[PDB]
Every structure is written in structure tokens, then in C-alpha cells.
Amino acid sequence: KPFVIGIAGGTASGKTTLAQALARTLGERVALLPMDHYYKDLGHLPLEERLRVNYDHPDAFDLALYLEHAQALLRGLPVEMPVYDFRAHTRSPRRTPVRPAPVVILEGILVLYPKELRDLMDLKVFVDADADERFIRRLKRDVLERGRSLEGVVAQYLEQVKPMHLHFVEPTKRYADVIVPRGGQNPVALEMLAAKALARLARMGAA
Amino acid sequence: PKPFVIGIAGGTASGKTTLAQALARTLGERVALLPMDHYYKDLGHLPLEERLRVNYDHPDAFDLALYLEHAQALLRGLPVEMPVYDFRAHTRSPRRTPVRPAPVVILEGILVLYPKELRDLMDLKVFVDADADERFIRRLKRDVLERGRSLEGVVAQYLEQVKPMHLHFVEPTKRYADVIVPRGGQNPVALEMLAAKALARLARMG
Ligand SMILES: Nc1ccn([C@@H]2O[C@H](CO)[C@@H](O)[C@H]2O)c(=O)n1
Ligand SMILES: Nc1ccn([C@@H]2O[C@H](CO)[C@@H](O)[C@H]2O)c(=O)n1
């Protein structure tokens, strides 16, 4: 049985980085599935309509698919992970191979919302950061990498990302076993999580 | 070598004591526990009324010198005579309890993360989080059930001292935390995580 780690947290909280650093520390032994790339394929709709969608509401996510893949890896099967194109606002034509592994990291802003996802997790983590600090990174990433305007980001954040976060994301902190501050730069928490996983991996091999 | 030093702070009644004991219990006879809440400055010379007015949530109320001395001695592989605080009498007791050195040292208390000098000694800084309302429930059940406190007394001490000093001194130390731990009283996962970190540090020292 693969050690399942659930990593949730607000947008730009450091959960992507934390997840990757943990993935990098265990090498070939981890499969990382970012739920933030599993938005429903709305490619058949005009840009005007893909731009109105609230991408922070659980309904914007293809939970069916995400869970299908989470369960495939749990049975030692690989998946063709979809890739969301954040610049064009649609499911990209690009796919990415994710091989099964003894450690599966389920990372995303809402990976702790559906009970179906929680039941698959051995360790549930919430990466904590104050919205002001997170907004700074959100804005930077959006203007530098996603073709987003200054006004567009503020608008999106205030009428969507934020209220959705307070109402959906943030409450899932109650389901967390451990809370990680400064997810992006916390070598101590990283080591402890690696150690936790290393111990479980040892239980897999040892008998 | 050098012992693994874990700091466990949090508000009053957050679970910091139970988590500290659970971790100590699990690691067996390989841990030394120093509850800073038993290191209040000895004030037995003062009259009871004076002792009842002291703000026991302010930094100046703690004998950090003694605490730091005991922390340094334990790190140098030396046992210590830990003072025992009497909460019913509101004064340090004349008798102390011995605490032997160990490969794992736990420094637990509401303000263990406040002094810059205590943090420097810590390898892993932990903060047990629990909402103020919930913490107040337990703090209130305990004070009346085992500390001879009146219902009115607990409320006055909380609103006038415990709460203000928490927002001002305690809560902010959460910024120094390497990891935050919710439900410190019954969190098996977080315990196996903390234990996992300790065992690896024990592996590194011998
Ligand atoms: N087309 C999309 C889809 C998602 N997002 C933002 O991504 C965050 C989760 O990664 C969510 O916080 C969401 O706001 C976005 O800007 N545009
Ligand atoms: N004589 C004393 C001394 C301290 N305390 C309370 O103990 C808590 C720290 O465990 C602190 O929260 C502090 O208020 C107490 O109730 N009575």
C-alpha cells in the first residue's frame, strides 16, 4: 500500500513547491498529482465563457477524473495526467505520464474538500500562509507567467479566489493532521515529512 | 554529540502538555521533558494577595535564567533538579523533582518560543494550535476541577491577563514555528511524525 500524502492550502501558499521538494527528496519513489490541473475540459466553449467560470469553486474541478487517477496509482497503474493551460484558460492538448510509486502526493487547493479524497490519505497536510503574502506571489506569478493583467488579477481574486477560499479551502484546515507554515521555504518541516515517509517506506520493504 | 531539542509552544490548554507527554511516552526512556510552566519565578516571600495579582502570562513572571541553565545542563549530559510549581497555592513548592539527561529533550510551555535564547537551542520548533474559545473550555474545566479556582476568578484572570498576553506574546511566536500542530491532545498522525523525526536524530547521534 502506497503512503498517501494530501497537501492542501490556499493559492500561492507554497504547497506546489513543498510537494515538489518532498518529491525531489524521495526521488523515483513519489508520484505527484496536482489537482489544480484537473479543471473540467471546457475547450468547446468561447473564451468569454471560460473567463466567467469561478475556478475556485469545487464545481470547476473534474473530481471524477482526479479520483480515477488517484485510484489507478493506488493499484499500481500509471496515468496520462492532463495539463491545464493557465494562459489560454483551457485544458491543454499536452498530457504528462505519471508512473505508479510507493508514495503518492495528492496536491491542490481543494484536495481536502471531498471526503472521497480524504479517505485515500494517510497524512493530510495544509500549508498555511496569510492571504496578503499569498496574494503577492499570486499576483507575481500571474503577471509574469500567465498573461494576466493587474486589474484582472485583483478583480478575480476579490470576487472569486478570496471568497471561495474563505468559504471552501480554509475550512478544510480542520481535516489536517499537520499545518506547514512558509511551505515554500521550510527545510525543517520538509525533513520531518521526508522522515515520516522514509519510515513508512521502510515498513514497506522491511518485514 | 548533542541532544535533539524540540520546542513545543502554544496557548494555555492547547494540548501542548499532552502532545509533549505522548511523544515522550512513545519514545520510551529516551526523552527529557522540561515544562517551562513549572519554572515561574519563586515568589514564596510575597503575601498571598500579592501572589494572586501577579500576571502569570507575562514573560517577566518566568525564571528563564533557571530554565536556560537547566536546558544547557541537560544538553551537556547533566541531570537537573526541576522546580515544581503549586497552582493551588500559587507558589513554587520547596521540593523539586529530578530529571535525568537524555538523547531527546523537550522544552514545553506557553512561552518557550518567545526567548531568542531558547529558540537557538531548538532543532525543531512546534506550535500546538487550538482556537481560543476551545482552549478556554479546557482551561476552565481544569482550573475549577483541580486547581481550586472560582468561576469568576478564571474569567477575570483570562480577560484581564491570559488573553491579552496570549495575543501580545504567545500567538506571535507561532511565526517562529517550523510546524503547527492542531488537535494536540488526540493527533496520532502528528505524533508518529514527531516520533519519526526524533528516531532519525537518535540514529544520527548514536
Ligand atoms: N483558468 C484558470 C484556472 C485556475 N486559476 C487559478 O488557479 C488556482 C488554483 O491553482 C485557483 O486559485 C484559480 O483562481 C486561474 O487563474 N485560471
Ligand atoms: N499561579 C498561577 C500561575 C500560572 N497560571 C496559569 O498557568 C498557565 C501556564 O500553564 C498560564 O496560562 C497561567 O495563567 C495560573 O493559572 N496560576
Side-chain angles (χ1 to χ4, degrees):
Chain A
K1 287 184 179 296
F3 181 52
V4 184
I5 306 300
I7 311 298
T11 175
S13 61
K15 61 179 179 58
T16 294
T17 290
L18 183 66
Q20 301 184 324
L22 183 60
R24 199 178 314 132
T25 288
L26 303 186
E28 301 163 18
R29 300 185 292 177
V30 47
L32 171 60
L33 275 203
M35 201 180 106
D36 295 336
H37 281 279
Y38 285 71
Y39 284 97
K40 289 173 184 171
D41 190 344
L42 302 180
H44 61 296
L45 294 174
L47 190 58
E48 299 96 303
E49 291 212 68
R50 302 200 302 272
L51 292 175
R52 304 205 313 276
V53 177
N54 179 359
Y55 291 103
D56 294 73
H57 186 294
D59 287 9
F61 288 83
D62 195 336
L63 174 67
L65 183 66
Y66 190 65
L67 183 57
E68 188 193 279
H69 289 192
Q71 288 171 334
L73 301 163
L74 266 22
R75 301 192 305 131
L77 308 166
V79 303
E80 281 300 311
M81 182 198 120
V83 172
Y84 192 84
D85 178 338
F86 299 93
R87 299 182 72 222
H89 301 287
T90 199
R91 175 166 302 187
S92 175
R94 303 171 284 176
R95 308 288 291 215
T96 192
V98 169
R99 310 309 318 262
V103 172
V104 301
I105 301 292
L106 293 187
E107 187 267 287
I109 52 167
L110 293 166
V111 292
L112 290 182
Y113 179 66
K115 172 172 171 57
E116 292 72 45
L117 283 188
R118 285 193 256 98
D119 295 351
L120 296 181
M121 302 168 190
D122 290 289
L123 168 63
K124 300 171 177 64
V125 177
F126 188 94
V127 176
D128 208 358
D130 296 336
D132 53 4
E133 295 189 37
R134 291 188 300 104
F135 178 89
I136 288 298
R137 294 187 292 262
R138 170 64 179 246
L139 178 85
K140 290 190 177 184
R141 186 199 68 195
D142 277 9
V143 176
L144 310 183
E145 309 179 337
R146 309 191 174 178
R148 310 294 179 89
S149 61
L150 161 66
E151 183 173 19
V153 186
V154 168
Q156 192 188 340
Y157 178 84
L158 287 174
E159 48 193 86
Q160 278 173 352
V161 186
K162 185 178 175 183
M164 288 306 111
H165 177 260
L166 294 166
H167 186 85
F168 292 123
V169 191
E170 199 64 27
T172 69
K173 213 206 304 199
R174 305 292 177 169
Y175 303 126
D177 299 298
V178 179
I179 293 164
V180 181
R182 300 166 287 154
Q185 198 176 12
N186 193 344
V188 177
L190 176 61
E191 180 169 349
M192 188 183 44
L193 285 164
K196 169 65 174 294
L198 283 180
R200 303 295 290 266
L201 291 156
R203 314 297 168 242
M204 282 170 214
Chain B
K2 209 72 171 190
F4 181 40
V5 191
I6 310 166
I8 302 164
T12 166
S14 53
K16 62 192 187 55
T17 300
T18 293
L19 175 73
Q21 284 169 37
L23 180 67
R25 178 191 308 139
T26 300
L27 300 181
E29 304 182 286
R30 289 182 172 189
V31 63
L33 176 45
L34 278 198
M36 192 189 205
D37 53 279
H38 271 280
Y39 283 80
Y40 280 110
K41 282 177 180 177
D42 190 326
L43 302 179
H45 62 283
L46 294 168
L48 181 52
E49 209 182 326
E50 281 261 292
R51 273 181 275 140
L52 294 166
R53 287 175 48 248
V54 179
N55 184 329
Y56 292 100
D57 296 81
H58 194 284
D60 291 341
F62 294 84
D63 191 3
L64 170 55
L66 183 65
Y67 193 59
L68 183 62
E69 180 190 323
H70 285 191
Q72 284 160 338
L74 274 176
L75 262 47
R76 286 180 287 119
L78 294 148
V80 294
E81 293 291 315
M82 180 192 96
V84 180
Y85 191 89
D86 190 332
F87 296 94
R88 316 184 68 234
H90 300 268
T91 179
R92 172 184 297 190
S93 66
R95 230 273 261 80
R96 295 195 187 182
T97 59
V99 176
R100 288 181 56 218
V104 172
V105 178
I106 298 166
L107 304 182
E108 173 263 279
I110 60 166
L111 290 169
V112 300
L113 292 189
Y114 177 83
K116 199 288 179 72
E117 315 91 275
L118 291 182
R119 296 197 304 269
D120 288 345
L121 302 173
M122 298 153 177
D123 295 297
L124 171 63
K125 319 178 205 298
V126 177
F127 189 100
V128 187
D129 209 8
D131 289 353
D133 48 14
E134 295 179 39
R135 289 190 296 97
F136 169 78
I137 311 301
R138 291 184 295 266
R139 163 62 176 253
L140 171 73
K141 281 184 171 174
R142 178 201 68 189
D143 285 7
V144 174
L145 296 189
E146 59 198 69
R147 298 191 174 182
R149 308 297 170 85
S150 69
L151 240 139
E152 176 176 29
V154 183
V155 175
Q157 188 184 346
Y158 188 75
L159 295 184
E160 297 164 34
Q161 302 169 337
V162 193
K163 175 171 180 174
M165 298 304 109
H166 179 84
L167 296 178
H168 198 84
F169 294 102
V170 189
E171 190 68 14
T173 67
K174 179 168 66 185
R175 301 287 177 185
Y176 298 112
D178 288 312
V179 163
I180 309 302
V181 178
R183 301 180 289 95
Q186 224 297 281
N187 192 322
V189 181
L191 182 53
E192 265 33 75
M193 182 211 262
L194 288 183
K197 181 66 162 62
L199 293 168
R201 285 300 182 87
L202 295 179
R204 183 170 173 282
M205 65 179 72

